Amino acid sequence: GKECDCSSPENPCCDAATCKLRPGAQCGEGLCCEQCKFSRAGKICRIARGDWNDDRCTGQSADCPRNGLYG
């Protein structure tokens, strides 16, 4: 797919050359990324703007998906 897994070219978790994870880290930068690995689904990645449901990570991705009341 793309060739840049991270957005920061100064991040050690993702090779600046291929902007991708150099080591065996499941993620270089992101909200669901913990210890450079895929945390777990239903992970709090953000808060709800109002009062419905908090943000929960997929656990298999590094970026947190929108699980609030918008989309």
Tab-separated table of C-alpha atoms in Angstrom:
chain	number	residue	atom	x	y	z
A	1	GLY	CA	0.000	0.000	0.000
A	2	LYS	CA	1.414	3.433	0.903
A	3	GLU	CA	5.102	3.746	1.862
A	4	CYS	CA	4.931	5.952	4.982
A	5	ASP	CA	3.592	4.163	8.084
A	6	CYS	CA	4.420	7.149	10.328
A	7	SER	CA	4.078	10.920	9.822
A	8	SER	CA	7.171	12.039	11.768
A	9	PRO	CA	10.450	11.613	9.854
A	10	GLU	CA	12.303	12.031	13.170
A	11	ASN	CA	10.623	8.993	14.765
A	12	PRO	CA	12.973	6.069	15.473
A	13	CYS	CA	10.114	3.536	15.338
A	14	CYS	CA	9.606	4.217	11.610
A	15	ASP	CA	12.460	4.392	9.077
A	16	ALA	CA	12.638	7.973	7.770
A	17	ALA	CA	13.759	6.577	4.392
A	18	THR	CA	10.699	4.357	3.846
A	19	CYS	CA	8.776	6.261	6.575
A	20	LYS	CA	7.701	2.778	7.714
A	21	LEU	CA	8.307	0.635	10.813
A	22	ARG	CA	11.974	-0.409	10.546
A	23	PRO	CA	11.977	-2.882	13.464
A	24	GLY	CA	9.231	-5.441	14.192
A	25	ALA	CA	7.120	-2.705	15.816
A	26	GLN	CA	3.443	-2.946	14.771
A	27	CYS	CA	3.291	0.860	14.802
A	28	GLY	CA	5.697	3.801	14.779
A	29	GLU	CA	3.304	6.606	15.727
A	30	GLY	CA	-0.449	6.775	16.454
A	31	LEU	CA	-3.076	6.775	19.236
A	32	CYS	CA	-3.598	2.998	19.511
A	33	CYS	CA	0.183	2.578	19.210
A	34	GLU	CA	1.733	1.563	22.555
A	35	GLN	CA	5.386	0.479	22.876
A	36	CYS	CA	5.401	0.610	19.060
A	37	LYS	CA	2.862	-2.232	18.884
A	38	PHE	CA	-0.885	-2.629	18.317
A	39	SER	CA	-2.505	-2.010	21.713
A	40	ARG	CA	-5.973	-3.574	22.129
A	41	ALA	CA	-9.450	-2.852	20.719
A	42	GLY	CA	-11.838	-0.788	22.824
A	43	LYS	CA	-8.767	1.190	23.890
A	44	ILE	CA	-9.493	4.756	25.009
A	45	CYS	CA	-7.877	6.906	22.313
A	46	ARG	CA	-9.942	10.051	22.805
A	47	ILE	CA	-12.979	11.468	24.619
A	48	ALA	CA	-16.564	12.127	23.487
A	49	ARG	CA	-17.418	15.752	22.648
A	50	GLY	CA	-20.626	15.842	24.717
A	51	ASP	CA	-21.751	12.737	26.631
A	52	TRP	CA	-22.381	9.532	24.641
A	53	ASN	CA	-19.539	7.057	24.067
A	54	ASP	CA	-15.782	7.534	24.594
A	55	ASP	CA	-13.295	6.789	21.790
A	56	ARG	CA	-12.196	3.130	21.600
A	57	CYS	CA	-9.259	1.863	19.493
A	58	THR	CA	-9.620	-1.151	17.175
A	59	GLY	CA	-6.606	-2.859	18.783
A	60	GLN	CA	-5.418	-3.981	15.324
A	61	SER	CA	-4.703	-0.474	13.983
A	62	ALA	CA	-2.491	2.379	15.242
A	63	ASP	CA	-4.836	5.282	14.436
A	64	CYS	CA	-7.974	5.494	16.588
A	65	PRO	CA	-11.227	5.064	14.693
A	66	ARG	CA	-14.176	7.436	15.267
A	67	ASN	CA	-16.523	5.525	17.605
A	68	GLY	CA	-18.325	8.564	19.068
A	69	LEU	CA	-21.695	9.745	17.703
A	70	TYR	CA	-20.376	11.211	14.427
A	71	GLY	CA	-19.428	9.764	11.016
